[PDB]
């Protein structure tokens, strides 16, 4: 069906500017409005504006405008977005969409509605370069537990106990655009007292762009 | 009303830039002067000759402008004057000069050309407007993989518009 594999998250200086991509694959890549819409990492859907490629007919936003361009490049078969003064409140995701048409196609009548989509990166801008932190036991019939993933950079790392072992009753917590300029992160699982010495309980962790995948006693 | 019938189909564009210079109206309104004064006469007389032959030269108006309406009906041209086709210039054998037929020759000589395959051409009207194209749109209502992606016959039907 139609495929829009948008390009990759990013890290940059604020202050500058930034692109990104879109690059359909199926269907038609003029002849149908391409689009672009925002939403902040935990806010609704917010919609910017578009593109129709085959006539250039730019529908732009009714607050960025000004402070935004896209493009259509049939020639090889792309589409770009150009924002600029790169920000902390431009932080949000950015999905690539582009309009659905009616049958199971990519040629007839089309809707007027986003209904074949792309995987969409978060685009969050960067204010430090990256580190790589260290994982603790956090201390507590059950007893509670943590590996306190705090003040890394960048987004994201993941948390798995006893290399996924242990599969049942974990409870992750979301990555921190925190106030130091880096992230922190949290992730408790739930285990019992009486078994602290008898299966030690070991979490991992990974962070990519910081290169560190220790593993991390818990003994408390 | 036939006021440039003697002039050439390119000075008779000009006919076909006016209500075909009036011709279809002067056929359905020239009953006016019948339509006046059938029953303006109070008057016995007894006997009608013109009570056949008025009715006649008038039923025979009426089926004759019915028959061109009933035929732009079966070419999918109904209302519309000036209407395009499905069918292409095929075979038929008057093959000749765009600039010669809509610059410099006439509506009758154009008839003197074409005198032969007219009911050709109108048996082969209907034919690309219904054997294909309303079982097509029959077919526009329901679709496998091919109504959104065939894959095919796009290029052909591309194709179609390219040669
Ligand atoms: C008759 O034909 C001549 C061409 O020599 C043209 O100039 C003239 O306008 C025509 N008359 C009418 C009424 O179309
Ligand atoms: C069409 O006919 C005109 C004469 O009416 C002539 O001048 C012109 O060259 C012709 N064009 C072609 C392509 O034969
Ligand atoms: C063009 O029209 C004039 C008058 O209408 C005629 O005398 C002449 O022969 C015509 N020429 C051609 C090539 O049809
Ligand atoms: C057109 O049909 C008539 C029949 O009356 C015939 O005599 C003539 O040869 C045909 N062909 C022409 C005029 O080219």
């Known amino acids: 069906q139609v495929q829009l594999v948008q390009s990759g998250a990013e890290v940059k200086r604020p202050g500058s500017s930034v692109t990104v991509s879109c690059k359909a694959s199926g269907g038609s890549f003029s002849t149908y409005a391409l689009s672009w819409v925002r939403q902040a990492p935990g806010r609704g859907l917010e919609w910017m504006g578009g593109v129709i490629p085959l006539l250039t007919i730019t529908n732009y936003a009714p607050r960025f405008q000004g402070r935004i361009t896209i493009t259509a490049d049939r020639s090889t078969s792309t589409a770009y977005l150009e924002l600029n003064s790169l920000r902390p409140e431009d932080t949000a995701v950015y999905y690539c969409?582009?309009?659905?048409?009616?049958?199971?196609?990519?040629?007839?009548?089309?809707?007027?509605?986003?209904?074949?989509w792309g995987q969409g990166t978060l685009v969050t801008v960067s204010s430090a370069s990256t580190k790589g932190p260290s994982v603790f036991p956090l201390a507590p019939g059950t007893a509670a537990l943590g590996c306190l993933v705090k003040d890394y950079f960048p987004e994201p790392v993941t948390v798995s106990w006893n290399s996924g072992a242990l599969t049942s009753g974990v409870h992750t917590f979301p990555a921190v655009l925190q106030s130091s300029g880096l992230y922190s992160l949290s992730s408790v699982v739930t285990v019992p007292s009486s078994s602290l010495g008898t299966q030690t309980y070991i979490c991992n962790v990974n962070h990519k762009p910081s290169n560190t995948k220790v593993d991390k006693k818990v003994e408390p | 009303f036939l006021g440039a019938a003697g002039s050439t189909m390119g000075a008779a564009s000009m006919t076909l830039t006016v209500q075909a210079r009036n011709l279809l109206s002067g056929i359905v309104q020239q009953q006016s002067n019948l339509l006046r004064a059938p029953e303006a006469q109070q008057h016995l007389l007894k006997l009608t000759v013109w009570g056949i032959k008025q009715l006649q030269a008038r039923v025979l108006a009426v089926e004759r402008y019915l028959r061109d309406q009933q035929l732009l009906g079966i070419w999918g041209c109904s209302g519309k004057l000036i209407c395009c086709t499905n069918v292409p210039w095929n075979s038929s054998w008057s093959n000749r000069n765009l600039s010669e037929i809509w610059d410099n020759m006439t509506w009758l000589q154009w008839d003197k050309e074409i005198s032969n395959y007219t009911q050709i051409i109108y048996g082969l009207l209907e034919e690309s407007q219904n054997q294909q194209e309303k079982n097509e749109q029959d077919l526009l209502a329901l679709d496998k993989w091919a109504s959104l992606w065939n894959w095919f016959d796009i290029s052909n039907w591309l194709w179609y518009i390219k040669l």
């Open positions: 969409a582009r309009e659905g048409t009616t049958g199971w196609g990519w040629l007839g009548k089309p809707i007027g509605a986003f209904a074949h």
